Structure 1
Amino acid sequence: GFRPSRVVVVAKTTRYEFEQQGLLERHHIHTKNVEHIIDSLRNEGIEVRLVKRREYDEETVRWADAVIAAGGDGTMLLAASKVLDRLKPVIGVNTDPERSEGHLCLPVRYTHSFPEALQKFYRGEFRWLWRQRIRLYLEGTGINPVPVDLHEASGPQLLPVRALNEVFIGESLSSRASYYEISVDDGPWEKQKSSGLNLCTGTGSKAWSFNINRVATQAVEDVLNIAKRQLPLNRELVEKVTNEYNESLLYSPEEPKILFSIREPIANRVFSSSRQRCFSSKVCVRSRCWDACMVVDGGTSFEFNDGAIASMMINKEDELRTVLLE
């Protein structure tokens, strides 16, 4: 079984609010789905607190026996940003299924049919899913560990956020390429040059790390012609090879490997570079950057310039307690 007696809900802040604080149809809907959620809860003898960005403090989180994101994977990532305890269930409801993807949120039937999931909880007609998350240690010189809420010679210190999707590292200016020395599973330092790095979990293996590494159905077409050029096949086969490739880009969130990737490295005779991607347990990056940041779930940011040393790994006491319905 499972039913909590205290719940905080953290609702995204629709563009119609973003301004006030076809964009009305947007807001009326998100409202008409927060409403259906809170009223389904209160119909089950459940004290609920409803909050937005700055209200949603960890004090709220401690109070509640579970946490609901009423929004999208952002709002998931948001709520899942302020949760360190691997026992606290974090739950998201896709509040806008024509706009919000909601890959971290429940099946979309449960949006307007919410008491149904709730029943499935009291009865346990579900599963528990502990998604691994990435934690980050910052050492080096001149470092600056104060996080930055993007949504408006020292030692190793634990930064106050766990990365559920990925950690992004690169120059702030999107056009100034990035320089840093990197070490994987405690290997020798290799000076890469790229437009950044991306160290996802299996949760975020579908996220940003997918759209980097994935290939074109065309780039597949090309390479295959070129192969019999340098038993043929057709349109249908192109996709029954292309996806089997791109499948090998995703892994199970429970798997505790980090999938790091070089984001557009730089070839040539003065910038000899390593691999594109591979899995690991632990990475370590020495910023040789002038004005870069460390960017977690596209939501929190740390100053990561020269002499700073960030080192990412997975720890079990970070796995995120989430659920799972048929």
Structure 2
Amino acid sequence: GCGSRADGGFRPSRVVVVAKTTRYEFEQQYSGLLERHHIHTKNVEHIIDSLRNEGIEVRLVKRREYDEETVRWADAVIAAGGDGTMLLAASKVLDRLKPVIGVNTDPERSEGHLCLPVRYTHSFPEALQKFYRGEFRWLWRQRIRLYLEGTGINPVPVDLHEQASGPQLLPVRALNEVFIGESLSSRASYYEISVDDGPWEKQKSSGLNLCTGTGSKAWSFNINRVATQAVEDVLNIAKRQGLNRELVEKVTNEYNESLLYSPEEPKILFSIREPIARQRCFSSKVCVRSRCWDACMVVDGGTSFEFNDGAIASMMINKEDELRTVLLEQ
């Protein structure tokens, strides 16, 4: 039931297409990796010809060439690849009126929950028609804003895909989540946390995940979901201390469902990842004081910010940061 129907048609003049970098292409900077490159490149051409046949002026760019100037030149952004390319596309759109549309250029292998339905990959003119008639819904997805302050801070971001101070609004917003933790996988993180302006709790864990409704289907879900076997063990323990397989798969699914919420809900699902002796809650604001030696904040898996002892971060949710996305019929 999400979104709202378009008031009129969507008939843009200028569109930037940002295209995924294929596994084959990553080497330039065995048979099947070339195939998946042809499939993708073929679908990007299909997208570009469709735009051009309608009369939309089109710029094709890769990650290295997708900058703020092209976003401002464009009336709309089209991410051609997968959910990651949606994440790339959105990282440089800060205007809540500029639409961002994702097309899964490889349906049979990288099914992407942030892109149009797979039918519109091979039938993309049909999507452009529906846009023209106004037969679609706008969906404004909430995103997370990040402020950084403290001593020895560094607000300059690092693109992971290419290898005393007042509060500072960081240059990206999180569509999926903000991950806060030590740069290195195997080293535990130490920080003080304040949820909704509450008291500071000292915490030692393997990181923090702060996600949106959009992001709740992503890392947060795998951080927090329970397996059908665990539910079965819990019940057997309860049945033994105090059961069909369809009845067990249903409690699991109902439980795992409660981990998911609407991408329109302006709330943060805050998960403490593997705490060491509240692990998860909803919130409007979270503030983290870093107490670690070599930590980072990673936004949507791609933009990293240094986050070392004496840095303070505050994440919250602002209407200005909504991402204008679309919902198509089928």
Compute the TM-score of the two structures, normalised by the length of structure 1: 0.96
Q: Hey, what's the Cα distance between the residues in 2 that align with 1:6 and 1:15? A: 29
Q: Hey, what's the Cα distance between the residues in 2 that align with 1:19 and 1:323? A: 34
Q: What do residues 139-196 of structure 1 show as CA deviations (whole Å, max 9, x unaligned)?
A: 1111111101111111101000001100001111111100000000000000111000
- Structure 1 residue 44: deviation in Å? 0.5
Q: From 68, 83, 86, give the equivalent of 1:73.
A: 83
Q: What do residues 41-75 of structure 1 show as CA deviations (whole Å, max 9, x unaligned)?
A: 11101100000011111111111100000001110
Q: Does 1:48 align with 2:49?
A: no
- Structure 1 residue 20: deviation in Å? 2.0
Q: Hey, what's the Cα distance between the residues in 1 that align with 2:58 and 2:235? A: 57
Query: How many residues get paired?
Result: 317
- Structure 1 residue 240: deviation in Å? 1.1
SS at match of 1:86: coil
Q: Does 1:166 align with 2:169?
A: no
Q: Hey, what's the Cα distance between the residues in 1 that align with 2:119 and 2:10? A: 20
Q: Hey, what's the Cα distance between the residues in 1 that align with 2:116 and 2:283? A: 29
Q: Hey, what's the Cα distance between the residues in 1 that align with 2:47 and 2:78? A: 10
1:148 corresponds in structure 2 to 158
Q: Hey, what's the Cα distance between the residues in 1 that align with 2:183 and 2:71? A: 32
SS at match of 1:164: coil
Matches within 5 A, 1:28-67: 28-67=38-77
Identity %: 100
Q: Does 1:312 align with 2:315?
A: yes
SS at match of 2:42: helix
Q: Hey, what's the Cα distance between the residues in 1 that align with 2:227 and 2:113? A: 22
Q: Hey, what's the Cα distance between the residues in 2 that align with 1:59 and 1:198? A: 31
- Structure 1 residue 252: deviation in Å? 0.5
Q: Hey, what's the Cα distance between the residues in 1 that align with 2:145 and 2:185? A: 25
Q: Hey, what's the Cα distance between the residues in 1 that align with 2:111 and 2:207? A: 25
Q: CA RMSD in A?
A: 0.7
Displaced runs of 4 or more, over 3 A? none
Q: Hey, what's the Cα distance between the residues in 2 that align with 1:176 and 1:46? A: 50
Q: Hey, what's the Cα distance between the residues in 2 that align with 1:20 and 1:286? A: 41
- Structure 1 residue 289: deviation in Å? 0.6
Compute the TM-score of the two structures, normalised by the length of structure 2: 0.95
Q: Hey, what's the Cα distance between the residues in 1 that align with 2:248 and 2:56? A: 52
Q: Hey, what's the Cα distance between the residues in 1 that align with 2:271 and 2:232? A: 24
2:290 corresponds in structure 1 to 287
- Structure 1 residue 15: deviation in Å? 1.2
SS at match of 1:145: coil
Q: Hey, what's the Cα distance between the residues in 2 that align with 1:46 and 1:303? A: 40
- Structure 1 residue 260: deviation in Å? 0.7
SS at match of 1:289: coil
The structure that is helix-richer by fraction is 2
- Structure 1 residue 203: deviation in Å? 0.4
Structure 1: which 5+ runs fail to align? 268-274
Q: From 11, 16, 27, give the equivalent of 2:19.
A: 11
- Structure 1 residue 318: deviation in Å? 0.2
Q: Hey, what's the Cα distance between the residues in 2 that align with 1:41 and 1:60? A: 17
Q: What do residues 177-222 of structure 1 show as CA deviations (whole Å, max 9, x unaligned)?
A: 0000000000000011100000000000001000000001000000
- Structure 1 residue 125: deviation in Å? 1.1
Q: From 277, 280, 288, give the equivalent of 1:277.
A: 280
Structure 2: which 5+ runs fail to align? 1-8
SS at match of 1:229: helix
- Structure 1 residue 101: deviation in Å? 2.2
Q: What do residues 215-246 of structure 1 show as CA deviations (whole Å, max 9, x unaligned)?
A: 0100000000111111xx21111111111111
